[PDB]
Design a protein around this ligand. Structure first.
Ligand SMILES: [Zn+2]
Lengths: 114, 23, 83, 96, 60, 206, 155, 126
RNA sequence: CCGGGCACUCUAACGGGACUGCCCGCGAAAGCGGGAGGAAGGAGGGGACGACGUCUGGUCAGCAUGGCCCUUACGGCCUGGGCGACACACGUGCUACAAUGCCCACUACAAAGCGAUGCCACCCGGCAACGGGGAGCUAAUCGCAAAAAGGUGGGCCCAGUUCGGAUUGGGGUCUGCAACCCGACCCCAUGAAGCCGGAAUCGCUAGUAAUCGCGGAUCAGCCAUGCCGCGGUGAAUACG
């Protein structure tokens, strides 16, 4: 379908685009504009010339699914290499952005270990 | 929800302005 | 982050020392109390014992640490787990 | 046009009523004593020096406002104007 | 270690940001009112003291 | 521990502020500061004379000062030396025109501070605390007071264990707002610590 | 509630039907003081029942309430090592509120997505003597009547 | 001719004016339904004019300030009750029994210190 | 908007007004129930107000204070780091888990405070944060400032969702001397758990709960979901 995945036909293209990893409401709200595509049309409600327009466009606008995940892990990979404090947090798998490490770090630490 | 910066309501509860809460 | 409208803050005396050893070539391992500065591309190839609160921790400056603060690579806290 | 600001209303009204007669003594217009809304500034605080955050105590500074204006300055009053009796809990503003 | 500290708060520092406000009366640092310069306690003492012009128990 | 200060409880109801002077945000904090130190400078400089009240009003660029005391002659000095001695020395501190005034304590057995002070100096001189209280409270009520109470807390009589002694007489309705009730506090410190002294003098429910 | 009996609040009769009881049912609908929201949701279901079985909705309403107004219920009583549930009568004050609370809850559980229809189906089946709210009233008094042996323990 | 009342209900002020006519309602230069569109409760403001039935008798020019529309509505119920008895004090009968002539003493209670709300004490665990 | 008026509201001072005042009945009375008027009725509501004392409660880290204790140091300065760690455990909060909802756009309606190196109108640039300009305001008049929920229309259509925003990558704005530990905010992307929660347990009886938003204190900044207030809507229930 599109760059990495398929959009849900019964859903409008707006949320469908955002289903692409590497695309939120913003780029979803924009690529339809640069491709002049009506967002209200469901994914099943999409013509080929529209999609190929949008497909080639968005696929040529931003790295979305795989290439994006490359740099993401890459950015954290390169962090872990230099040994920055941030890299320390990742290599420790602890809250990287100054969160209160003592409590409420389950999102970074997962299950509890009492 | 109210904790979403991207939501206008979030910036409302945040009491700020961004792309999604004009002034 | 520091506003790019504002200059890239770097502790001048430490920065100046780096520019000094540049003329004098890579040498004179620099102890620094100046955790807060950002590494400058000149600083690459140098080394610094960055002060950690009690100690000056030696850090070799590579290009992978140019756009960062000095103190980042000096972990001010020592953690080892529990038990 | 004259403002009056104090912490008492009586001293204001004492001051204001006195001044209101003053220009009334020898001139006009003596714009009536107009009570501006009293800017209050609350101050809350814990009663205890140490903790027990709960038990509080409220304080306030009702800077009571009053005002009068002079339509015709009536310089015979103007000397009377500058010849003023200002109690220690009152401040005054000038206009017309 | 307070007097020099409350004295140090008096002198001016190498950077304006270090300039903080202590109680003029008890030198306290926390709960210090810019409008008075007194701690929350010195205020309450002087409040009941009646030396605070206008100030009084605000009980609406 | 739990009761309210009687004076602040009655400001603007029956009792009046001790330093009446309007100020703005810009100058309230500064003019307050010298106002505080003026209370201290006159305090030591008039405690021997029996200071009662220090009313500090602020006219334009001159502090309307009023000191209530039982020893005006002790305040003024040798036919008015000390007054000038302080009226100048005061203005040296405040920097502005220190307008100093003295006011006697008519019936000093009703000045809750002075009644507190006098009890202090007695207990400052090892006198019988329990006795001095009653003798204190007595002439107070004997001086026409419509109700009087005195309390003292601390290491009563040098005992290593603290205690709160107190004697009262006549109606002392602390809750009555319109009950004119002069409060008097006396900090009486000993060789073995400090003793608190509080003077409650009900005069009239005006 | 030791000294007096804390007499009820005299509700304001509604604008549409002039009823307080309608106003009562609104309050059980109302959430977060959002009476404007809840008001429509009733008045919408007014239209709805006025469409499906077009009659007086209020005629549908009270008829619905009568089919769910309970009259006997249990009450817990741990006398001895056994907690009793004595069959008890119900005051009309509490008959409605219980019935009112019952219908709204069942209306909180129908599948239709908008509440106005859930209320719509609910009041209909309610006046039809059908639905869990009616079952709620059925189960209680049955449960109540099922334990009539504890009747004389009623206090 | 002109007839006046005042509306006060929980921080809502209502200036009501009764000029005889067909029952016009201008609320801040707006239609009643205009300024109260989508407001379920905002129909009973004329019910005092339905207590005494000069509905199509007096044209209602009214302004309101402060508080929500609902509070604005109650003040309207107050102001309508005023000029009526001012118009006809006999209207007090069939209003006092209807309670329109009494102001709602209810007001948002002061929020206490320690209490989250006027009575909302924080959940404590012993 | 103006002249024009103070009508009205409001502003802020003084008063009146509710006192079981009045009628019925009960009661020895006290009082009590009913009613009248009345805006308010029986403590009109809410505050401030905390008796003897109790807890050898808390505080020597606000302060003061006896005493003991150090004087090239336990004193003072600077620099930095810590107070922010973090397998864990508890308290108190916020956001939610959705359609009585969520998102978008337009349209309303407050109160209360704050503001001269501060509110900053308004304008421009900028996706925005914000930056460049820039008037008024020196305070009922200038601004903060939009109240928000609400109402209209649109979308979503039960979906881990257009729910959820946690985390994280990156790019920025501002303050600050300096935002690594350790700030906030904007933008992009990421889109965690979470489907109403065991044992248990909390608050609330009216404009209360609940919900929505607004201001101030500290403060340059803000780690504020806190605190103190302010207002919008606005309940159910009380047999006992
Ligand atoms: Zn202080």
């Amino acid at each position: 379908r599109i760059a990495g995945v398929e959009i849900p036909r019964n859903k409008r293209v707006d949320v469908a685009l955002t289903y692409i990893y590497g695309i939120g409401k913003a780029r979803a709200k924009e690529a339809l504009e640069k491709t002049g595509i009506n967002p209200a049309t469901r994914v099943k409600d999409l013509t080929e010339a529209e999609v190929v327009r949008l497909r080639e466009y968005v696929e040529n606008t931003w790295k979305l699914e795989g290439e994006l995940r490359a740099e993401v892990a890459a950015n954290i990979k390169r962090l872990m290499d230099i040994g920055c404090y941030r890299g320390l947090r990742h290599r420790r798998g602890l809250p990287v952005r100054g969160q209160r490490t003592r409590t409420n770090a389950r999102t970074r630490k997962g299950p509890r270990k009492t | 929800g109210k904790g979403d910066r991207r939501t206008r309501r979030g910036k409302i509860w945040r009491g700020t302005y961004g792309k999604y809460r004009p002034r | 982050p520091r506003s790019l409208k504002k200059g890239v803050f770097v502790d001048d005396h430490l920065l100046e020392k780096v520019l000094e050893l540049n003329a004098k070539g890579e040498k004179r391992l620099i102890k620094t109390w100046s955790r807060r500065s950002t590494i400058v591309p000149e600083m690459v190839g140098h080394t610094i014992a960055v002060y950690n609160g009690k100690q000056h921790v030696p850090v070799y400056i590579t290009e992978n640490m140019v756009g960062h603060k000095l103190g980042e690579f000096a972990p001010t806290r020592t953690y080892r787990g529990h038990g | 046009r004259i403002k009056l600001r104090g912490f008492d209303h009586k001293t204001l009204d004492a001051s204001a009523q006195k001044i209101v007669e003053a220009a009334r003594r020898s001139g006009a217009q003596v714009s009536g004593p107009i009570p501006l809304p009293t800017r209050v500034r609350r101050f809350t605080v814990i009663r205890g020096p140490f903790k027990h955050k709960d038990s509080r105590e409220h304080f306030e500074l009702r800077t009571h406002n009053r005002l009068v204006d002079i339509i015709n300055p009536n310089r015979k009053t103007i000397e009377q104007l500058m010849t003023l009796d200002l109690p220690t809990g009152v401040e005054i503003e000038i206009k017309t | 270690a307070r007097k020099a500290l409350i004295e140090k708060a008096k002198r001016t520092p190498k950077f304006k940001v270090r300039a903080y406000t202590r109680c003029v009366r008890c030198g306290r640092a926390r709960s210090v009112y810019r409008f008075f310069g007194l701690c929350r306690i010195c205020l309450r003492e002087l409040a009941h003291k009646g030396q605070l012009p206008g100030v009084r128990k605000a009980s609406w | 521990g739990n009761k309210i200060h009687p004076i602040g409880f009655r400001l603007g109801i029956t009792r009046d502020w001790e330093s009446r002077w309007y100020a703005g945000k810009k100058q309230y904090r500064h003019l307050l500061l010298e106002d505080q130190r003026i209370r201290g400078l006159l305090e030591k400089e008039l405690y021997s004379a029996g200071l009662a009240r220090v009313d500090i009003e602020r006219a334009a660029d001159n502090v309307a000062v009023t000191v209530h005391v039982a020893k005006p002659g002790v305040v003024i000095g040798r036919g008015g030396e000390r007054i000038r001695v302080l009226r100048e020395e005061l203005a040296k501190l405040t920097g502005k025109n220190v307008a100093l005034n003295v006011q006697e304590v008519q019936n000093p057995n009703l000045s809750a501070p002075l009644v507190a002070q006098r009890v202090a100096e007695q207990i400052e001189r090892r006198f019988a605390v329990r006795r001095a209280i009653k003798q204190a409270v007595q002439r107070v009520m004997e001086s026409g007071a419509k109700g009087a109470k005195v309390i003292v807390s601390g290491r009563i009589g040098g005992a290593e264990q603290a205690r709160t002694e107190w004697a009262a007489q006549g109606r002392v309705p602390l809750h009555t707002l319109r009950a004119n009730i002069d409060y008097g506090f006396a900090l009486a410190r000993t060789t073995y610590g400090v003793l608190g002294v509080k003077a409650y003098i009900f005069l009239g429910e005006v | 509630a030791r000294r007096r009996r804390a007499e009820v609040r005299q509700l304001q009769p509604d604008l549409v039907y002039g009823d307080v009881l309608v106003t009562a049912f609104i309050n059980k609908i109302m959430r977060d003081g959002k009476k404007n929201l809840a008001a429509r949701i009733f008045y919408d279901a007014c239209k709805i029942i006025q469409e499906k079985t077009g009659q007086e909705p209020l005629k549908v309403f009270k008829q619905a309430v009568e089919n769910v107004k309970p009259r006997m219920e249990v009450r817990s009583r741990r006398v001895g090592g056994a907690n009793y549930q004595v069959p008890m009568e119900v005051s009309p004050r509490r008959q409605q509120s219980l019935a009112l609370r019952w219908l709204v809850q069942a209306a909180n559980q129908r599948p239709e997505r908008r509440a106005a229809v859930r209320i719509a189906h609910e009041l209909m089946d309610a006046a039809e003597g059908k639905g869990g709210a009616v079952k709620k009233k059925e189960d209680v008094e049955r449960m109540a009547e099922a334990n009539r042996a504890y009747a004389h323990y009623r206090w | 001719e002109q007839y006046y009342g005042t509306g006060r209900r929980k921080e809502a002020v209502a200036r009501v004016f009764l000029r005889p006519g067909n029952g016009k309602v201008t609320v801040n230069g707006q239609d009643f339904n205009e300024y109260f569109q989508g407001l379920v409760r905002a129909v009973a403001a004329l019910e005092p004019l339905r207590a005494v039935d000069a509905l199509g008798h007096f044209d209602a020019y009214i302004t309101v300030r402060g508080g929500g529309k609902s509070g604005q509505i109650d003040a309207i119920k107050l102001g309508i009750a005023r000029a009526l008895v001012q118009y006809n004090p006999d209207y007090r009968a069939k209003l006092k029994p209807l309670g329109f002539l009494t102001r709602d003493a209810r007001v948002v209670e002061r929020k206490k210190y320690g209490k989250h709300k006027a009575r909302r004490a924080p959940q404590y665990s012993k």
